[PDB]
Subunit: 669 residues, 2 copies
């Protein structure tokens, strides 16, 4: 044998077999990271007695870093804040960790309404890190060094072809799709793949039938540009759809003559340095047409809709049909690619703010709070709803404290500036307020939502909805959750009067409509209204949130496919836009070593991991504890069977898409 004293010596004495630099950091050792924060003064300061100051320790933030280290640093600090939140909510008893029995009267003292002065819609009033409720938002600009090595980063460029190349090199190799992005497709820019996102990407649920009036406007704007075939297509008017972001102005208080801009101040600790960076945004409008075979096809994009099409800049597609051929390949149609990117920035905002944050997280929270204030724990409604809300309130607070003012409001183009002293005077937050105000609980029950946005998913046998798997899956899933809810709710609620004389349903509806500020929540008096509202809550908690968030990384990670905002002003008119080139597009995306664009790319690629990083386990758990609980038992067995049966159907709607179309695995049990 070689003895162990010889093996030891040969390892210590000989050169190194393995060079650390060839092995990049994948996740921080938690202990080491917490320390480095300390050493850097990225930490809360305190007085002799133990109480907080209000301030951090470090006066300035970090100097140097590397995209990969800063990327993971943001992630870790965020996950720290969430634990901090979780722990804080345990102490207060907003979400206790070890269960606690609490009368309904003590819960009214614990669960209170915030008052709107933090700048948010109504939520749990919150009041160690959440005791001074800003200083945490500080700590994120402190982790983002003032400059980083730009070599071997995903934004360096200088061209799209460069960042495409880099993107693919970072891929590993349904389960898979998680670990790649839309860059995997060489034609990530294609009209087909662009519009497809309005049916099966992260915001599948806001596109709607275009109205006769809008159609008329574009018929008129088409005529002005001497474009006869477009005019005909529109005038004939068969299945014209619209995705309409023009409400950005209405929702921020913007006038039609004002331009969306976010001037970003470089701070040195807290004071500015003089250096600024502007990001720009737009209240775009896309008109599409949906063909018989199923392919949604884009016809027109209005970059920023300023009151009328006369006052705006509309560009029409050279291809009038998925199969049309122009002399200029889609790849080199730069104005149109610019237009498409612009519309993508609009969708980023509407998705992130309204469809994700507002329509799943913040409405749900108003309902969580009201439920705890109004229904005692023993009751059926409580018993059925509460499992879907676990650890939800604490997470919503991290988002409020840090995610919106630190990231969403930093990389948007709404401004007016960043950072911002008051969040009431900040456009992102007004946009959140408006989304909240204009949410309609009932209109968003799946069957009403499709019918209203104008889709006969339910009955159509033509196959023109085969490329709308969100719709097809959700019709089916919604009815399966409903059926479950029904079997359970009907075990006690045997006629509409049991609902009408329930001691709690009445004030619950009231609490929500008023303090919760969701007037569109039903005033429940029927069993069918009770079934539907509860189905919407389970819908909102699991599958809607999962549809709207699970492929967030896939769609945003490769920033050129769907950038948060523009890095340059919009063109001054149509003529300018028609002369756009690859450089005009590229300038407007966060690519290169200049204008703090790396910081934008960094945050834009990170947001998914910060927002990301099921119903069978539910059904299975429910069946086991319940072994009228005999009715609750069979309801959960049946529910289990049907979700499985549906899984096969979602994989069919995914396959049944037209050829080449990206998969839709998002609702797999």
């Amino acid at each position: 044998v070689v003895p162990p004293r010889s093996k030891l010596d040969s390892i210590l004495s000989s050169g190194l077999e393995h060079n650390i630099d060839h092995d990049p950091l994948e996740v921080w050792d938690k202990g080491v990271f917490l320390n480095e924060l300390l050493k850097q003064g990225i930490a809360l300061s305190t007085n002799e007695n133990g109480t907080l100051d209000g301030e951090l320790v470090a006066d300035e933030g970090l100097k140097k870093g590397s995209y990969k280290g800063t990327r993971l640093a943001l992630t870790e600090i965020y996950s720290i804040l969430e634990d901090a939140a979780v722990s804080h909510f345990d102490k207060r008893g907003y979400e206790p960790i070890f269960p606690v029995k609490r009368e309904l009267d003590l819960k009214k003292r614990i669960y209170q309404w915030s008052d709107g002065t933090d700048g948010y819609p109504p939520h749990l009033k919150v009041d160690q890190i959440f005791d001074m409720q800003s200083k945490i938002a500080q700590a994120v600009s402190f982790i983002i060094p003032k400059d980083i090595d730009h070599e071997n980063t995903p934004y360096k460029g200088p061209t799209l072809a460069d960042v495409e190349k880099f993107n693919k090199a970072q891929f590993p190799k349904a389960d898979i799709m998680k670990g790649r992005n839309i860059g995997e497709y060489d034609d990530w820019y294609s009209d087909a793949r662009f519009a497809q996102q309005h049916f099966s990407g992260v915001n599948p649920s806001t596109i709607e039938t275009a109205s006769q009036d809008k159609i008329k406007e574009y018929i008129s704007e088409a005529q002005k540009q001497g474009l006869d075939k477009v005019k005909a297509i529109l005038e004939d008017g068969k299945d014209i759809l619209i995705q309409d972001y023009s409400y950005f102005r209405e929702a921020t208080g913007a006038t039609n003559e004002q331009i969306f801009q976010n001037t970003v101040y470089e701070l040195k600790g807290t004071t500015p340095t003089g250096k600024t960076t502007s990001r720009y945004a737009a209240a775009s409008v896309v008109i599409f047409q949906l063909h018989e075979d199923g392919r949604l096809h884009p016809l027109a994009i209005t970059l920023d809709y300023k009151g009328s099409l006369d006052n705006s800049i509309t560009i029409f597609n050279r291809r009038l049909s998925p199969d049309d051929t122009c002399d200029i390949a889609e790849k080199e149609d730069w104005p149109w690619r610019y237009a498409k990117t612009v519309a993508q920035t609009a969708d980023w905002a509407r998705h992130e703010v309204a469809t994700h944050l507002v329509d799943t997280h913040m409405i749900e929270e108003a309902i969580i709070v009201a439920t705890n204030r109004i229904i005692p724990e023993g009751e059926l409604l409580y018993e059925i709803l509460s499992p879907h809300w676990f650890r939800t309130l604490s997470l919503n607070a991290a988002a409020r404290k840090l995610l919106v003012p630190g990231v969403i409001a930093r990389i948007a183009g709404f401004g007016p500036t960043s950072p911002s002293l008051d969040f009431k005077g900040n456009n992102a937050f007004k946009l959140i307020d408006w989304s909240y105000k204009n949410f309609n609980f009932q209109d968003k029950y799946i069957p009403n939502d499709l019918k209203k946005r104008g889709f006969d998913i339910k009955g159509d046998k033509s196959g023109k909805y085969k490329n709308y798997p969100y719709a097809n899956d959700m019709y089916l899933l919604w009815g399966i959750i409903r059926n479950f809810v029904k079997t359970v709710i009907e075990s006690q609620y045997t006629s509409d009067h049991v609902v009408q004389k329930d001691p709690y349903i009445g004030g619950w509806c009231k609490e929500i409509q008023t303090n919760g500020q969701i007037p569109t929540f039903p005033t429940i008096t029927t069993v069918e209204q009770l079934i539907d509202a509860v189905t919407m809550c389970i819908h909102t908690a699991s599958p809607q949130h999962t549809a709207v968030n699970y492929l967030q990384d896939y769609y945003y990670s490769f920033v050129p496919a769907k950038p948060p905002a523009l890095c340059t002003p919009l063109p001054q008119d149509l003529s300018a836009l028609q002369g756009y080139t690859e450089k005009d597009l590229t300038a407007a995306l966060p690519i290169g070593t200049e204008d703090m664009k790396w910081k934008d790319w960094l945050l834009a690629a990170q947001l998914p991991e910060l927002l990301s990083y099921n119903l069978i386990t539910y059904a299975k758990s429910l069946y086991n504890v319940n072994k009228n609980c005999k009715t609750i038992k069979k309801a959960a067995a049946d529910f289990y069977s049907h979700l499985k049966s549906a899984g096969v159907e979602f994989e069919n709607y995914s396959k049944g898409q037209t050829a080449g179309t990206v998969e839709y695995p998002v609702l797999q049990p």
Copy 2:
């Protein structure tokens, strides 16, 4: 085919899937928290918000299923840990978001407990939770398709194999049952070198050898006597200190009478579990195979006063008339010794020697060294979330599980935690720990192994020893490079403002007198190496294959389900039924509950967690502005060597004699 037609065909048609064929794997956390409520497995409160002291439920659960109760315990435990983690954040014992705190404020926060709780000294934290585990374990369960049902060994062996995941980390998901000869002497003794307690076996002394030489002559056994007399490499694993450590007299029997509570009051039904202060003598052959020779069931002061049985096989290759499989007395003896090891491992080697000593050192460090300092900066990462977890263990794991399934008693549950034998055992283990003797090189030398120099290959089946010699020196080298960046001569150590009181704090309040009084750089290097040793690889060696070794309970049961035999003659007439009766197999005598807890303890103790991520994290923060340039190269070198060592641990594993279970446990 529209979605209204798919919906109808799913609702109307019979069920395509039957839930019972798809067994619960993990609880939906929301549902479970609710059930606890509905069942009153929850803390009660007054109108104002303050606690009562009591739970809600008067009684515990009635009905359940092994799988659901298995996972229920797991969940409730993980809940308690979060509760702990959250509670330590509020108090500021382990803040989650960092905060800067002067050394004088930390003395107010980090205080010494006072021994009143029955434990050795630990962080002072500022019996209704133990209640809540007996409440989650229903008073009866469906016994069909469970791993204890039996009625025979051959039945529970058959079941065990069927639950293996379907076809290193493989090994994670399976247990020693995988081997048909799990009962074999070879596999039994091998555990004393490469199973969860590899580090307590030692050379037998001339006096012990003499006792067994005498007891051998009494039984007319001449070849054994010769082997022992010749005396070449005789080793011992000696649990006889169980009595000394509990205050037991030689004329008292280890027993734990288990009271069935109906809420809080007993029902009259009781169940006894029994334990023993066994002693195994082994002999270690030239080829490398440790072989057992004698087992003393319960050493009562002298061998005259005890019951020793000697192996019929005097050698790994020996053949008797009776196959190992049907040598029932000897299989009984071996199981008995296994119960001894379970206790020593769980109490001393795991919870005392890694978790509780470490905590005393964590507390002293925060009381004595300011955060900025080097020692603080290098030690603290290895202690992440450790204190909160030690508290869960104190509140619930020891009184609820370890003290329930042991045979030390005297009863369970127990009002008094002092005067509970399990705790006295923990007190004694803590007292008799020797920090310095357990530095790896001293630990091998002391237990009597020339691992360091041997070229014969008689330690080729001791991969813990071989790996640890090598790992210990790699961690030391790292520690040295770092410690020497500021500690350049023994005087820097002698005039340090903090190392002096740190050593004192630990020796006194921490009650580890065996901690060095550090005045040299080499004493500083060694102590820090031991702390990293204790935090990562020792803890990993003694805990990572806990599931492998314990989850098939007959291979290593926590305690006996029946008294020991009244004398040697009785034992020699033992049969399969005598063994089986003494293991937790069957529907009766609350044995399912013991099997349940015994198989669960690993999952409760076994819960982003290694030295490579460490080295890699350290390298990266020290690439931007002691000397950080020296700390950088130290962590690069450390990384390279751990990887280079990984190959050497896989060699020591392969280099074992043929058929010997793998030892993947220290893989980076």
